[PDB]
């Protein structure tokens, strides 16, 4: 999977067999790190009008 955004350390507890994570909008929000069992969180950085 691809994407762009910061990788914060959330508290979303996944299942032992689940790897990815989505929301009611069906978009990537949290992906588990392969090496260490640490659930991250994907959120885009700042964007808007000037």
């Amino acid at each position: 999977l691809t994407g762009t955004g910061v990788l914060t350390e959330s508290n979303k507890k996944f299942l032992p067999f689940q790897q990815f994570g989505r929301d009611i909008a069906d978009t990537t929000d949290a992906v588990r790190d392969p090496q260490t069992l640490e659930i991250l969180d994907i959120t885009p950085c700042s964007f808007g009008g000037v």
């Binding site: 762009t4 909008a25 978009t27 959120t43 885009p44 964007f47 808007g48 009008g49």
Partner: protein, 222 residues
């Protein structure tokens, strides 16, 4: 089954009969009306071409529809702001209620603000606020006037209507007792003043009972 329009009443019409009422009851109702919506704004490129160069080069050949939709969204936002700006902001000077509650019989406790919570609102406003429940270029713009300013405007209008009656919307506010104000309200619909100056007790009791029924219906039903 087949729906029925209603009952079957037969008024006994006669050329020498009339029916004059002898009593009266005060009833308070409610009415819901929307004012504005949420201020949203969708981006053109970030929604269509997500981090792509050839996509943007192809989009640049489709004219300037992005400017059209951006202007449309800006107009929608400024119109939704002007809606509430014209609905609520209608008083010049912010009024307030006096400390002593000298209102004879009338107990305005469920509509006046309560200085115990940060966002000062009445019990009915709290019930109304408790009953109602950045991924692909989307962004919600915040409203110009916050909820506390709207609550303060409503409280000022309520205090003005309670104290000055109908004299604060046509110039300078004029103090007037609530009993004489209700007497004028009754005189405006034909009923004389002696009907109120002798039944103030029953009128205040019916008003309090109606307020209680309204708040109970708002708290029970959703």
């Amino acid at each position: 089954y087949t729906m029925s329009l209603g009952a079957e009443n037969s008024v006994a019409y006669s050329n020498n009969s009339i029916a004059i009422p002898t009593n009266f009851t005060i009833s308070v109702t409610t009415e819901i009306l929307p004012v504005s919506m949420t201020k949203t704004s969708v981006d053109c490129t970030m929604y269509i071409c997500g981090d792509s160069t050839e996509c943007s080069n192809l989009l640049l050949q489709y004219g300037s529809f992005c400017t059209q939709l951006n202007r449309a969204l800006t107009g929608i936002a400024v119109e939704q702001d002007k809606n509430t700006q014209e609905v609520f902001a209608q008083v010049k000077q912010i009024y307030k209620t006096p400390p002593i509650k000298d209102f004879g019989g009338f107990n305005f406790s469920q509509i006046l603000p309560d200085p115990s919570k940060p966002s000062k609102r009445s019990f009915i406003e709290d019930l109304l606020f408790n009953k109602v429940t950045k991924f692909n270029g989307l962004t919600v713009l915040p409203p110009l006037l916050t909820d506390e300013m709207i609550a303060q405007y409503t409280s000022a209008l309520l205090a003005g209507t309670i104290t000055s009656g109908w004299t604060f919307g046509a110039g300078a506010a004029l103090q007037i007792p609530f009993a004489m104000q209700m007497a004028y309200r009754f005189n405006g619909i034909g009923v004389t003043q002696n009907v109120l100056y002798e039944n103030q007790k029953l009128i205040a009791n019916q008003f309090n009972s109606a307020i209680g029924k309204i708040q109970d219906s708002l708290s029970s039903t959703a």
